[PDB]
Design a protein around this nucleic acid. Structure first.
Ligand SMILES: [Ca+2]
Length: 579
DNA sequence: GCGATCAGCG
DNA sequence: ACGCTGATCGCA
């Protein structure tokens, strides 16, 4: 019902200087995954190509890599990375329908061409799930069915670029797509493909010691419980703590007793066992997520792990990282932080280099709120998290432990993002009256922040959405809900999304500027990871001293705010040492 | 499959 | 009853 040429070879008219291009990769994780078919729609017609012939045709390969041959796509990073695993470079991507739809409305959850097309009342294309099936029934359909599906996705991309660009422009988001999100997409593709090398010998050695410690702690739990049970069975763990041992019930879940860490540490005065349960869980998390789980995704021949950075997922414009998630490797407890010793440079005589923004969101907040006291504080390079800890624990700066500071950091963001006296009291284990008084005092010193919180909520009610500094957008229909609890969650999104999203806009622009600078200086240094406000590179040790001056300066100059940006940086032989 | 839990980011 | 995530596990 859609006409296309099922082509046995590549012809010249498939190689126009503008085209919609589909390079179909069905597996969720696209690293080293099969390319099942290719579709091209342009001024001369619609074409399906089998990958075994198109990708071995030198004229098609050259066309893929020629940046002056413009291609419109859906999820170009997926295609570019899968093409890299075939040793083929993809250049010239000038429109990405996934990123366009994510910018117009991140809450759509647009995950295939059909869902984006529906935004514009275009429905001549099927959802990928209807074509490939789900779960165990998932499969590549017969070639005629496959070819028509890829042609229809291309034809839709061809038709939808113009109406998506028009709405992007009306939102002031067209340059956010063309100059920020699409250039970043190519950079993430390089980072994912390069991967991160892993010391599997050290990881496996840590894993075997972990298992020994796990058994020990597990046994002392049974002998403290008087009996044996399944320390991961909530019904059984609840029965031990809150029936057998008769500990107080501080919190319930939808299903029964709560046993979260916060609860367990309030019960620590009552019984020895709760601290052992915490230690047991922590060691168990290292074992299953960070030892076993990481070894499961190491590519064995290279010892590299290849994450996927999802760039059209979070509602605030942050990236997220999957399989493995390399944005939540342990760091806060010393036993957990040791995991980062297994992350090593991919060449001999190279080093890991990490640079991170200092108090990024509070600096964004001071700029956006134009709070005089908060702006003066960062003009002075004060550490607000340390000063707040000094205040909270009545200590001197000399005596601020990394953990009191991590705790104070949660108070600082909690207050600006809407924590209640009740919630602050539970976090600090203080009186609820004290908690309210402290919050009131905090807004006395920063009345511009209080004003900003009120104004941004009112602006979300009037406009229906909030925006970031680079015009990322988030719709908030619930902000006018008649239900109090639904409205409240929405008001706290209005307070938080412009701040966290603007901080995401800044690190994204820093990544684009850093890549261009590394290329200008003809250095081998390249990005490996982003962790929200931190960038991790590797480079020859010969380049470290230049990177100590180049990387902070690029990051600090990515944007100009009413306060300076500050970057801390470290390097060393493993990711552990780059801190 | 989902909710509780915990690892990270602010 | 601060916000944004992803992986694992048991299943009241
Ligand atoms: Ca930081």
């Amino acid at each position: 019902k859609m006409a296309f040429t099922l082509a046995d070879r590549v012809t010249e008219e498939m190689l126009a200087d503008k085209a919609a291009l589909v390079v179909e990769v069905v597996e969720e994780n696209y690293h080293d995954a099969p390319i099942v078919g290719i579709a091209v729609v342009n001024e001369h017609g619609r074409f399906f190509l089998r990958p075994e012939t198109a990708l071995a045709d030198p004229q098609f390969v050259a066309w893929l890599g020629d940046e002056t041959k413009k291609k419109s796509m859906f999820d170009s990073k997926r295609a570019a990375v899968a093409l890299k695993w075939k040793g083929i470079e993809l250049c010239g991507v000038s429109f990405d329908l996934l990123l366009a739809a994510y910018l117009l409305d991140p809450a759509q959850g647009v995950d295939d061409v059909a869902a984006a097309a529906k935004m514009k009342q275009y429905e001549a294309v099927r959802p990928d799930e209807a074509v490939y099936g789900k779960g165990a029934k998932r499969a590549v359909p017969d070639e005629p069915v496959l070819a028509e599906h890829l042609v229809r996705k291309a034809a839709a991309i061809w038709e939808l670029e113009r109406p998506f660009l028009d709405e992007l422009r009306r939102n002031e988001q067209d340059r956010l797509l063309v100059e920020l999100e699409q250039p970043l997409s190519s950079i993430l593709a390089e980072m994912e493909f390069a991967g991160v090398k892993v010391d599997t010998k050290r990881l496996e050695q840590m894993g075997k010691e972990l298992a020994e410690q796990l058994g020990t702690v597990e046994q002392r739990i049974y002998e403290l419980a008087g009996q044996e049970f399944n320390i991961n069975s909530p019904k059984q763990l609840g029965v031990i703590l809150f029936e057998k041992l008769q500990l107080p019930v501080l919190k319930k879940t939808k299903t029964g007793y709560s046993t979260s860490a916060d609860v367990l540490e309030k019960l620590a005065p009552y019984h020895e066992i709760v601290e052992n349960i915490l230690h047991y869980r922590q060691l168990g998390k290292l074992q299953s997520t960070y030892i076993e789980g990481l070894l499961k995704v190491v590519r064995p021949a290279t010892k590299k792990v290849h994450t996927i950075f999802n760039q059209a997922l979070t509602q605030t414009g942050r990236l997220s990282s999957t399989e493995p998630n390399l944005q939540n490797i342990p760091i806060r407890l010393e036993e957990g932080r040791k995991i980062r010793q297994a992350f090593v440079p991919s060449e001999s005589d190279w080093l890991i280099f990490a640079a991170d923004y200092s108090q990024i969101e509070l600096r964004v907040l001071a700029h956006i709120a134009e709070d005089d006291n908060l702006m003066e504080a960062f003009r002075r390079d004060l550490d607000i998290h340390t000063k707040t800890a000094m205040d909270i624990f009545q200590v001197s700066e000399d005596e601020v432990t990394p953990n009191m500071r991590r705790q104070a950091k949660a108070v600082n963001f909690g207050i600006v993002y809407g924590i209640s006296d009740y919630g602050l009291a539970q976090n600090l284990n203080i009186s609820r009256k004290e908690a309210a008084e402290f919050i009131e005092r905090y807004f006395e010193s920063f009345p511009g922040v209080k004003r900003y919180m009120e104004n941004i909520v009112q602006e979300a009610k009037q406009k229906g959405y909030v925006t970031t500094l680079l015009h990322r957008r988030r719709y908030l229909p619930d902000i006018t809900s008649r239900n109090f609890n639904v409205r409240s969650f929405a008001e706290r999104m209005a307070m938080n999304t412009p701040i966290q999203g603007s901080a995401a806009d800044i690190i994204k622009k820093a990544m684009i500027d850093l890549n261009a600078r590394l290329k200008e200086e003809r250095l081998q240094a390249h990005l490996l990871l982003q962790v929200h406000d931190e960038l991790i590179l590797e480079a020859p040790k010969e380049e470290m001293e230049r990177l100590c001056r180049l990387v902070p300066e690029v990051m600090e100059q990515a944007v100009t705010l009413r306060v300076p940006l500050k970057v801390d940086y470290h390097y060393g032989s493993t990711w552990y040492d780059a801190k």
